[PDB]
Write a protein that binds this ligand. Structure first.
Ligand SMILES: *[C@@H]1O[C@H](CO)[C@@H](O[C@@H]2O[C@H](CO)[C@@H](O)[C@H](O)[C@H]2NC(C)=O)[C@H](O)[C@H]1NC(C)=O
Ligand code: NAG
Ligand code: NAG
Lengths: 641, 192, 116, 214
């Protein structure tokens, strides 16, 4: 009997367009099907619309798009997990699979013009309302402002209808207010448990007149180095001029949450030409702490608290840099991107995330496997270095350790890491694999891609398979489905792919086929892969000055500035003096933060592959149910371990 | 203000999505200006010095700057209605200077001070009028007027509760000063 | 030169503005005229040979029309302030935009008097 | 001088496209689209006339990747390329036809070899991956136990080595170190050998053309 397969996202979202790809294998003729959704438990009949018929001309393919209504029954309970039932009626065959339903229904981004506000001054913040697809949406937003001790002071109830997703709001701080770290928190009406927040502080400040940046030569301190830590002070006026003053430097060890100061490291270096340097002899660092041991200092950190004073004795600026690590190794190895399951007798990919000790990705550092060290590669601009190891067709797990092989360094300084990968497990030990080898480079929208489908099966069953089914995730929901044909005998099939601007920032690709094997038992083999895309705006907004002459405009003199953006869009602007950024540069907003939030809000957390087909689909964030009885695992936790 | 401005742009496209522009820098710099550096808040009837900086970023030309402090009835400086406080300073090129003044605040609220500079042998002037906040002497202190538990069934009987809050004497409060009073209400969550 | 600057200062010290109008408005208007119709014009005029002759008829015309445009700005600030309350700083700041725009366009048009 | 008068705002060249394809494996097309004067065009969507779903955009070097699914037949294979840039009519788009010949083995034993390479603006230092796609029946598959690949820069043997391959694998991957001595191009040449037919020695070879940033 032909098998009917329904693929839906593993987590559903209220008030959103969620697709449900309907596919049938070996179907004969037109097979109409109506999809219905029922609450669990009970039967509340939330939605049973969007029925679709199937056609053999379109390879029995079809996707239904709808939106789960938001009712008080879902909002009645907010502290426990809730589920719904999706049921499909493939003619005379019935299939139904339960699925978890979350309460997230969009994102909130809070932009404040400044980051520090004096008492008695106004506050201007904008609330951005976007959905799971990062589009303007009309909802209801609650806004609250909380003082540092945790007491709401002002609450509102706005609506994003007719505002095109931008809600400008203002608030007036009383002239007599307890200073500290104020907080602004907002949440959607449907999901009061989901709280978004920003942080702005109230201070008794006056704007400075210059910026001080302390940049050590290397973002670390080698423990065995004899010269010691070197830090360079670069004091520059805000309006692009150099400083002639004097500076004070003090070095302290930051272990845990307790800061230990070094009285003997204080120096008075005269900054000249907007530059200066100061040394820290290793003897001072060793003797400052009680224990003269060396290895105990590993894991701690240093911080520089530089104070700069002009020769005129007018203004003082305190600039602090903290978090410089004390690590015996100038490099770090991470395996957050490498798949945890390989395929026996099949090429295996090893994405190594080589990064600087502070956390920033490294660049152009060689890496190599310990065994058969002839394999070498260099990290790209993103801090990821490709690797390739040939895997023997043995069911025994394989252990891989990688070690950087940069020259001019000893064997002790190179960072090491060890990883254990489990072999892919089939059904009935039929030795049926699928692998998907794909380019993983600094991909950009528009540039093409070449997915390499690599089937591996015995010649007795190489003719039953006649196609492939592949899906593309993006931001938690599907983006595109399709069938890639494969005539018998063609071992390798290439699938051209169009990476548009909608694939930002990381699309997860899955692929699977099906046939009858063993002694008449239906089975499925699947695969998944993780691909990165350049993090940039879906559109293109650029701000540039129209006036190309009359350098350094006089105050009070006009200029014209162009806004190059996509047509029909709404642009919000804000001009901020750089003094406040000198005195506070945290809790801002940028494209990187937005993409980090979107990536964090994903549904799967295993970069490709898995223990088995059910594991692969569960990790990829999809549930797969068949008419025959084949099914994936069960997901009942919002946050993966 | 003589400084550099940062412009941050955010779009909202109905079809594309949301974008955040890279910061844009414009540097508003003049060849001659004044940067009045002030403490954020001073105390009434207590002398505090102030510093005016006369920058000069021209070429090797020399400037014979004349700076004066116009009289303000809300401050006690050397400037009066009739007399004037004038200085004739010289700024070497690509250098700076600092002219100190003594100012004694008189009335609370929000007062302003300003200086004006005129260049000799040329014709260019720049005056800066900033406002420094004046606060009468004192500190912050917060005594609790009263704390009580609302329970009409347990307190007051008859399912009702009448609570009397005596106003704080505040005999040490500074005259002519505002005083807020935040009222907080919090229920008692009982469950299980 | 120097005599030309003295003549320009003599012309710009004949501008008569009402004291009865609001102090902040008066300061804003004076600052606008000083930074958009005095500083560039004084910079242009200062770089002339002493023998060069300077016209004054259309400079007096400049003064007459700057009187009338400041009068129109005060009109927009006083009662034609529909968006906010009359004599409020909000619509003063709102009208400062087109006031300064008109002034700079005026200067760009009048840059042809300075040489006959 | 030299501004042309051409009814088609684009040109298509097949100088970099291989003239022989292995049946039953992806035959790669190096479409070389250039401006009418001669400069390499950038960011124009090229496509195959059949199955228009396949398309790609040119890189900064004026070459666009392509991929077709060749059928396992010995008949000649014909490809025509027609750009499908929008806001232009059907006559402005440039067209070009090309007829490719199938690889011919010895003894008609279908002992093929394919060697697919990443094709982009390569730089010295950056690693590269080559895929060795063997094609033989499992009866004689176990005999091959290695590969031999040669590198040629400026017409000399730059590096010769042997890539091992354990039996049972349908493909292997050979990491490559592109130093500064590989400029500006090189040609991998991979071959193996085994006894074939009924006692006749057989050799099957392959080659690929790779560009490096100048
Ligand atoms: C999933 O649903 C979308 C809904 O639009 C389908 O998108 C349409 O695809 C057809 C051909 O594939 C186009 O002619 C239409 O223009 C598309 N619609 C829009 C609005 O652009 C999509 O095809 C569906 N997925 C599959 C695999 O069929
Ligand atoms: C009074 O204010 C202080 C901050 O100065 C803060 O601890 C709290 O609001 C009050 N103190 C106490 C002990 O409640
Ligand atoms: C010869 O081949 C070997 C193979 O490893 C290679 O290392 C060497 O550079 C080549 N040239 C010479 C002269 O050996």
């Amino acid at each position: 009997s032909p098998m009917y397969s329904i693929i839906t996202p593993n987590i559903l979202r209220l008030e959103s367009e969620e697709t449900m790809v309907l596919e049938a294998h070996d179907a004969q003729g037109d097979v109409p099907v109506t999809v219905t959704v029922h609450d669990f438990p009970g039967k509340k009949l939330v939605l049973s619309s969007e029925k679709t018929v199937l056609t053999p001309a379109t390879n029995h393919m079809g996707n239904v798009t709808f939106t789960i209504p938001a009712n008080r029954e879902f909002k009645s309970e907010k502290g426990r997990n809730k589920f719904v039932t999706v049921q499909a009626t493939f003619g005379t065959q019935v299939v139904e699979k339960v699925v978890l339903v979350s309460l997230q229904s969009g994102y909130l981004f809070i932009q404040t013009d400044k980051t520090i506000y004096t008492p008695g001054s106004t506050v201007l913040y904008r609330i951005f309302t976007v959905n799971h697809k990062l589009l303007p949406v009309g909802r209801t937003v609650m806004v609250n402002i909380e003082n540092p001790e945790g007491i709401p002071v002002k609450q509102d109830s706005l609506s994003s209808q007719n505002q095109l997703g931008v809600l400008p709001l203002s608030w007036d701080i009383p002239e007599l207010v307890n200073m500290g770290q104020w907080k602004i928190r907002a949440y959607y009406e449907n999901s009061p448990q989901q709280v978004f927040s920003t942080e702005f502080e109230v201070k008794e400040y006056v704007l400075p007149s210059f910026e001080v940046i302390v940049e050590p030569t290397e973002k670390f301190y080698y423990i065995y180095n004899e010269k010691g830590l070197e830090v360079t002070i670069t004091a520059r006026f805000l309006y692009g001029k150099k400083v002639e003053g004097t500076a004070f430097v003090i070095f302290g060890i930051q272990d845990g949450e307790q800061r230990i100061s070094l009285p003997e490291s204080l120096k008075r270096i005269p900054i000249e030409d907007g530059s200066g340097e100061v040394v820290l002899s290793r003897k001072v660092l060793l003797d400052g702490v009680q224990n003269p041991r060396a290895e105990d200092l590993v894991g701690k950190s240093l911080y520089v608290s530089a104070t700069v004073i002009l020769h005129s004795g007018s203004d003082m600026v305190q600039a602090e840099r903290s978090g410089i690590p004390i690590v015996t190794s100038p490099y770090q190895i991470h395996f957050t991107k490498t798949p945890k399951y390989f395929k026996p007798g099949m090429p295996f990919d090893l994405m190594v995330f080589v990064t600087n000790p502070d956390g920033s990705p490294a660049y152009r550092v060689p890496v190599a496997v310990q065994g058969e060290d002839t394999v070498q590669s260099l990290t790209q601009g993103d801090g990821v270095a490709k690797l390739s190891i040939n895997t023997h067709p043995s069911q025994k797990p394989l252990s891989i350790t990688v070690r950087t092989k940069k020259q001019e360094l000893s064997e002790a300084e190179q960072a090491t890491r060890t990883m254990q990968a489990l072999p892919y497990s089939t059904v009935g030990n039929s030795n049926n694999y699928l692998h998907l080898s794909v380019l993983r480079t600094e991909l950009r929208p528009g540039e093409t891609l070449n997915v390499n489908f690599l089937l591996r099966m015995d010649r007795a069953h190489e003719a039953k398979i006649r196609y492939y089914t592949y899906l593309i995730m993006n931001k938690g929901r599907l983006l595109k489905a399709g069938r890639q044909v494969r005539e018998p005998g063609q071992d390798l099939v290439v699938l051209p792919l169009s990476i548009t601007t909608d694939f930002i920032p990381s699309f997860r690709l899955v692929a699977y086929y099906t046939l009858i094997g063993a002694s008449g038992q239906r089975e499925v083999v699947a695969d998944s892969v993780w691909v990165d895309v350049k993090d940039s705006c879906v559109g293109s907004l650029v701000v540039k000055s129209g006036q190309s002459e009359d350098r350094q405009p006089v105050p009070g003199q006009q200029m014209t500035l162009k806004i190059e953006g996509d047509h029909g869009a709404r642009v919000v602007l804000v001009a901020v003096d750089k003094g406040v950024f000198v005195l506070n540069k945290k809790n801002k907003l940028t494209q990187s933060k937005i993409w980090d939030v979107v990536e964090k809000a994903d549904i799967g957390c295993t970069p490709g592959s898995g223990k088995d087909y059910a594991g692969v689909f569960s990790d990829a964030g999809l549930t797969f149910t068949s008419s025959s009885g084949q099914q994936t695992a069960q997901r009942a936790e919002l946050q993966c371990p | 203000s003589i400084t550099t401005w940062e412009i941050l742009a955010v779009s909202m496209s109905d079809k594309k999505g949301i974008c955040v522009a890279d910061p844009f820098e414009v540097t508003v710099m003049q060849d001659f200006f004044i940067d009045l550096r002030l403490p954020y808040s001073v105390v009434r009837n207590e002398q505090v010095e102030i510093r005016a900086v006369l920058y000069n970023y021209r070429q090797n030309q020399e400037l014979k700057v004349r700076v004066e402090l116009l009289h303000n009835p809300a401050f006690c400086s050397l400037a009066t209605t009739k007399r004037r406080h004038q200085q004739t300073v010289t700024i070497p090129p690509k250098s700076s200077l600092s002219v100190p003044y003594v100012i004694v605040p008189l009335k609370t609220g929000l007062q302003e001070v300003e200086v004006k500079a005129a260049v000799y042998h040329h014709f260019i002037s720049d005056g800066v009028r900033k406002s420094l906040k004046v606060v009468p002497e004192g500190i912050r202190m917060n005594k609790t007027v009263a704390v009580r538990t609302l329970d009409p069934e347990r307190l007051g009987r008859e399912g009702v509760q009448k609570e009397d809050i005596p106003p704080a004497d505040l005999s040490d409060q500074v005259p002519d000063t505002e005083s807020e009073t935040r009222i907080l209400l919090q229920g008692t969550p009982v469950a299980q | 030169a120097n005599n030309h600057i003295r003549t320009v200062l003599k012309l710009f010290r004949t501008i008569d503005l009402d004291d009865s109008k609001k102090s902040f408005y008066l300061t804003a208007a004076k600052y606008g005229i000083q930074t958009q119709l005095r500083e560039p014009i004084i910079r242009i005029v200062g770089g002339y040979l002493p023998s060069t002759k300077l016209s004054e008829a259309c400079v007096k015309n400049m003064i007459s029309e700057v009187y009338e445009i400041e009068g129109d700005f005060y009109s927009k600030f006083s009662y034609a302030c529909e968006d906010h309350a009359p004599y409020s700083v909000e619509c003063l700041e709102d009208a400062r935009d087109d006031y300064l725009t008109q002034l700079v366009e005026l200067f760009k048009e009048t840059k042809k008097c300075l040489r006959e």
